[PDB]
Ligand SMILES: CC(=O)Nc1nc(C)cs1
Ligand code: NA
């Protein structure tokens with residue numbers, strides 16, 4: 001995994017509403033393998049379900065998403081996982097809600 005990427009600048013402030021790691025996909029309603037977008041905080045399913053987060057990346061350009069299965073952060077441009085200080089606050093809020 002990368003220690004930085006050029007798309008970290010698109011990570012936006014965490015909503016005052018917080019995160020819900022059990023939130024369903026906004027398109028198909030599945031609860032199975034969802035991601036949250038770190039730009040606008042919408043929730044959509046992974047590529048092995050119905051591919052709605054990949055569709056969201058295509059229609060918005062938003063780069064970075066966080067997994068509600070394992071708290072990994074993926075960049076669709078770099079095609080890599082990313083670790084950086086800028087991601088710690090959102091990962092810690094998700095960890096508290098999940099566990
Ligand atoms: C490591 C890995 O593949 N994690 C994934 N998390 C989701 C939500 C889909 S795939
Ligand atoms: Na599928």
Ligand SMILES: [Zn+2]
Nearest residue numbers: 025028045052
């Ligand atoms: Zn879906």
Ligand SMILES: [Zn+2]
Nearest residue numbers: 037039040062
């Ligand atoms: Zn987005």
Ligand SMILES: [Zn+2]
Nearest residue numbers: 005007075078
């Ligand atoms: Zn990137």
